[PDB]
């Protein structure tokens, strides 16, 4: 007699995915709230204890196997936590919420949310390998390597911040409220620097070492954390390298990457095989996708996609930018159904690379604002393009929708789709195919004002009065990078169908995403 918490939507999606001999799986949570987070499902084949291993080691410090599952009475199952969840392939593709409940009475469904903060540090170490030894040493300082770790230090100065071990009465009860408190860990960002007392080949890693700060933690719990969060870090690392060695691809060296897959209310944490050849790295992305429950229609953990938590860490995009302001609104509105933009993209406007154009760059911003949105997607890893540089493809011309389409043809070998408008009220009679396109393609839209381009990322739809918003992100520059005044101005809000000028027409670029990453 206990409470279980599981979103089951989550789940069902993740079977969904894998679906995309028999099968099983592991469940990982939060043991103390009695909270799952990851349902992972799994073929028999990858349902050992060295699937398991790597499983764990890369999800968040404060989440563990805490049970497994059984399929129709007939998968494989491999102990375990501490419960069974009872699956049916009924309930599975119907998504029942409701048999899921009758089937596993402990448990209760839930939206679950993402919740506190994350901090960050760059930690360095090095690995010595015995030649023809290396597969056994690799193993061997790892262990070793983890009763190292309760001796290192972590320091904030611009804040006067420790984690560091202590005796359980030293702890400082909420020790970072101020900064976990309504945050969110794939953008609020506690930065440390890992510290250490004073007092063949050889391998060097060196990357950054994640773990969450949750709002009502003491001191001493962020210090458990961290040093989990960097156990499991070396033990991925561990794990990559035997596998390549293994696979006769010899002694990698790793990339450290963070990425928040899509549905995912924590982060998972990867030590990347980068010096692999293309093609060695496309597979193991592949079967990271299987192994993730990921889904494989798209791209998910390209290093484009990696979050960018640590200030060192390498970044395709600049740092300044901000990330999906369209995340921001807070006060919503919601007149009938939204469909939004499907994956994220950065804000780009007036006044921004050191250039000046407030009269004919408008276009230039929204090319870039797409622009961002395929690196930040997965789908290339070139930088958005300068005015000149797309120009190159006069000097100082305001330019328009069919350019832009043209540019993004030669620079991204990359194909689109118009749709064109006699009137400003004409751009409603088309919000079904261009609500259809954001479920899809779901890049973020052009639209070709008559002096004038805007950026659309949603509409907000209602197919009974018919009334319709449009979600617009202006390229018009009026902040420097303030949030506030972008989402209390006008420059990212939602609009109504009266925003469109009627006495002009209207053309709307909407860019297709290729079809393998």
Not at 393 to 414: M, P, Y
């Amino acid at each position: 007699n206990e409470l279980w918490f599981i979103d089951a939507q989550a789940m069902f999606q993740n079977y969904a995915n894998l679906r995309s001999t028999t099968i099983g799986g592991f469940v990982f949570g939060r043991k103390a709230r009695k909270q799952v987070i990851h349902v992972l499902f799994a073929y028999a084949e990858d349902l050992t204890e060295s699937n398991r291993q790597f499983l764990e080691s890369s999800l968040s410090a404060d989440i563990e196997l805490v049970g497994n599952l059984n399929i129709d009475g007939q998968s494989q199952i491999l102990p375990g936590g501490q419960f069974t969840l009872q699956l049916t392939s009924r309930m599975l593709e119907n998504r029942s919420i409701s048999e899921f409940l009758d089937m596993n009475v402990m448990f209760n469904n839930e939206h679950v949310l993402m919740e506190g903060a994350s901090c960050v540090s760059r930690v360095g170490y090095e690995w010595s390998l015995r030649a023809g030894r290396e597969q056994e040493d690799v193993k061997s300082a790892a262990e070793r390597l983890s009763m190292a770790s309760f001796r290192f230090t972590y320091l904030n100065a611009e804040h006067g911040l420790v984690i560091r071990e202590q005796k359980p009465e030293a702890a400082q009860q909420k020790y970072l409220d101020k900064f976990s408190k309504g945050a969110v860990p794939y953008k609020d960002v506690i930065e440390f620097t890992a510290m250490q007392s004073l007092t063949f080949t050889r391998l060097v890693t060196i990357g950054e070492v994640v773990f969450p700060a949750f709002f009502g933690d003491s001191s001493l719990d962020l210090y458990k954390r961290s040093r989990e969060a960097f156990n499991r870090r070396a033990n991925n690392t561990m794990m990559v390298t035997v596998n390549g060695i293994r696979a006769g691809r010899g002694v990698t060296t790793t990339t450290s990457a963070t990425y928040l897959p899509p549905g995912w209310v924590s982060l998972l944490h990867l030590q990347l095989p980068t010096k692999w050849t293309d093609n060695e790295q496309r597979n193991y992305r592949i079967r990271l996708h299987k192994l993730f429950n990921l889904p494989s229609s798209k791209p998910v953990l390209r290093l484009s996609q990696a979050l960018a938590l640590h200030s060192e860490s390498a970044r395709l995009t600049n740092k300044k930018l901000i990330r999906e302001p369209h995340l921001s609104i807070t006060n919503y509105q919601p007149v009938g159904e939204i469909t939004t933009v499907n994956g994220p993209y950065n804000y780009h406007h007036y006044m921004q690379d050191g250039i000046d154009d407030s009269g004919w760059g408008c276009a230039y911003r929204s090319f870039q604002t797409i622009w961002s949105w395929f690196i930040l997607n997965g789908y290339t890893d070139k930088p958005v393009p300068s005015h000149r540089e797309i120009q190159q493809a006069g000097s100082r011309q305001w330019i328009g929708s069919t350019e832009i389409s043209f540019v993004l043809n030669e620079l991204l070998k990359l194909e689109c789709r118009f749709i064109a408008t006699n009137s400003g009220a004409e751009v409603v009679e088309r919000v079904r195919e261009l609500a259809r396109h954001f479920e899809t393609s779901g890049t973020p839209v052009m639209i070709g004002g008559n002096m004038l381009a805007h950026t659309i990322l949603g509409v907000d739809f209602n197919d009974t009065t018919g009334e319709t918003k449009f979600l617009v992100l202006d390229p018009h520059y009026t902040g420097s990078e303030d949030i506030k005044t972008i989402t209390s101005k006008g420059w990212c809000a939602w609009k109504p169908a009266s925003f469109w000028s009627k006495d002009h027409f209207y053309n709307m670029v909407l860019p297709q995403p290729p079809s393998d990453a």
